[PDB]
Design a protein around this ligand. Structure first.
Ligand SMILES: O=c1[nH]cnc2c1ncn2[C@@H]1O[C@H](COP(=O)(O)O)[C@@H](O)[C@H]1O
Ligand SMILES: O=c1[nH]cnc2c1ncn2[C@@H]1O[C@H](COP(=O)(O)O)[C@@H](O)[C@H]1O
Ligand SMILES: O=c1[nH]cnc2c1ncn2[C@@H]1O[C@H](COP(=O)(O)O)[C@@H](O)[C@H]1O
Ligand SMILES: O=c1[nH]cnc2c1ncn2[C@@H]1O[C@H](COP(=O)(O)O)[C@@H](O)[C@H]1O
Ligand SMILES: [Mg+2]
Ligand SMILES: [Mg+2]
Ligand SMILES: [Mg+2]
Ligand SMILES: [Mg+2]
Ligand SMILES: [Mg+2]
Ligand SMILES: [Mg+2]
Ligand SMILES: [Mg+2]
Ligand SMILES: [Mg+2]
Lengths: 178, 178, 177, 177
């Protein structure tokens, strides 16, 4: 059972469920009367995206982006290639970026600019996970789930070689599988 | 509250949670030792995809397709345009198609053929919702959640003009909003 | 085809000469640089093909395929990226290749998007240009021909996906649209 | 550019004549049909441009952009669709336009995919063909030139994204690769 590959659980299932419910409540109050559109980057965000949206008692829309790197450029600039762009015209709408994890914040910042260029009336950022230590880009995080140490984690959408996304918790795999 | 726009609940939240858990158990037993890859079509499938995968205690992978219609052709042939193809090479892998709802079964059958052309060792179909009455294509459904009557439903991923995907149940909107 | 055409504005030989001319200029202007031609499908493929073969320099070629978001496109030129370029343009000298410049809205938008990827330099080239229709800043560095505000077809330009293959630039009979 | 070339196999005028010839044949063969040219980027744009302008018929043009899945591509020619065609080809007469046919694996695969969309007819056209390398059925209806098994560049064909713009077909010096 993939859970046996985990050497440590950082955030439990109930901790996750609770926070998502918490964030959903906050966002629900903050976007009352707004025109909320949730946007996340595949594939890791679908987990949090599905959970957060059900926690938001507001009429809202959902869309996704699929990106790819240009190589070294991306690594140091966060500049990425658009593989699947969002279909909903966010012009004049209140967009909330939904991330699974913020690390360097480079790609997030780049995508933020791109989304801005499409004139949304509002543009905020919500993430379930955040690694402050790794932060090497100026990104304002409006909503944040948990600050985790600098380790490679899996679960709740986060994978390693496409596996472990289905774990109900956030944990660290054994080095052997790394 | 979007739930007030609903004139009737067909499948409750607990009914959904229960079935997804049920299906996950079945699939878990059936894919023991297999090389399971879950594939769904955006955007409606992310809800069921996220829930079903967590209900499957097996190492597994997830990927998505994004499609668009060619017009009348699609309507009568199910032939669609690929907007976002799956990234994982499914050659020799046990693929399980994850649908939110099977209606005519036309697009599902078309996409099934395309997926077959990529030589997966196995290719099955799982859906949370199914409208038998509308079925106008020969599609073998291996796993099925609930058979619903011929009505336009929303919730758990299903939308209407991009809204209602975040409802925790499957229901029918009031005709006024239609 | 040559039956729904009200009049021919630019001949095939006219197009060839101008392409050779623009190619020669770019060869001189970009000598010693890391040149990348980026055209916007589908219309730009004729010009892209003819211009690149007329540039006597080592260069790369890539394309963008875009789509409209609705009215947000008509008024602000904001578009959806359906196919992005694969070549990493950071530190490179990019030359946008266009079939025709009109309002300049979409062009202005894509221009900013590419700048977002930090190219060393970014210029714009188009075979056709409709001056009296401009409604966006955008500087055009290389331009083939200035034309009146008529619906033209040919050399890549279509009407309902037709006429792109005409080897000349012609005016479509208004009755056809 | 013309410095890393070991030898020239086909001149620019040679390419032009053949394109005109293939265009004339297709004009005769497809008269009265609903023709749709579909080329595979990036390599096919030169030939696509030259061939379409040499077909004196009303036609449509579209493109496919593909990517590899890994080894599954090398052995079975199975590819990932990065950019699909927008034109609905059902009931239409499609002509796949290729820059070069080698093993024929990817071509065979895309061919089946397009057939899946029920076109009235489906034929294949290529400017270049390497016979001794074929490792897939696939019938070629229109072919420009047969060439030996050498790595060629030019008229759309590249090596590391370079040389597509050469106006002739040349053999790349082995040292360069
Ligand atoms: O600890 C981590 N685990 C998994 N992905 C991470 C982590 N930190 C940052 N990432 C990034 O998360 C992105 C997720 O890609 P996805 O798996 O396709 O959704 C990648 O670009 C990773 O580099
Ligand atoms: O009752 C229904 N509600 C919503 N979508 C439905 C229903 N029955 C069939 N569909 C199809 O579900 C697909 C879902 O598209 P999506 O919303 O982008 O995920 C569409 O092509 C619909 O035609
Ligand atoms: O007279 C004209 N003929 C063809 N295209 C035109 C003309 N004037 C402006 N355009 C632009 O050409 C673009 C071409 O899109 P494409 O056909 O997909 O390459 C359109 O979005 C138009 O806005
Ligand atoms: O000699 C050659 N020069 C260039 N491409 C070749 C040659 N032989 C085979 N090819 C094929 O050309 C394809 C071109 O891809 P493109 O450059 O993206 O258009 C490659 O995937 C190769 O398999
Ligand atoms: Mg992310
Ligand atoms: Mg990942
Ligand atoms: Mg579906
Ligand atoms: Mg829908
Ligand atoms: Mg253009
Ligand atoms: Mg057009
Ligand atoms: Mg080719
Ligand atoms: Mg190549």
């Amino acid at each position: 059972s993939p859970m046996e590959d985990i050497e440590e659980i950082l955030i439990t299932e109930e901790q996750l469920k609770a926070k998502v419910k918490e964030l959903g409540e906050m966002i629900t109050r903050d976007y009352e009367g707004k025109d909320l559109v949730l946007i996340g980057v595949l594939k890791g965000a679908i987990m949090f995206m599905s959970g957060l949206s059900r926690a938001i008692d507001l009429p809202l829309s959902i869309d996704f982006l699929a990106v790819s790197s240009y190589g070294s450029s991306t690594k140091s600039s966060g500049i990425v290639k658009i593989i699947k762009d969002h279909d909903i015209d966010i012009e004049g709408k209140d967009v909330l970026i939904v991330e699974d994890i913020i690390d360097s914040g480079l790609t997030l910042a780049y995508l933020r600019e791109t989304l801005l260029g499409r004139k949304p009336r509002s543009l905020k950022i919500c993430t379930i996970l955040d690694k402050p230590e790794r932060r090497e880009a100026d990104v304002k995080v409006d909503y944040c789930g948990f600050k985790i140490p600098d380790k490679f984690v899996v679960g709740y959408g986060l994978d390693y070689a496409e596996k472990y996304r289905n774990l109900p918790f956030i944990g660290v795999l054994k080095p052997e599988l790394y």
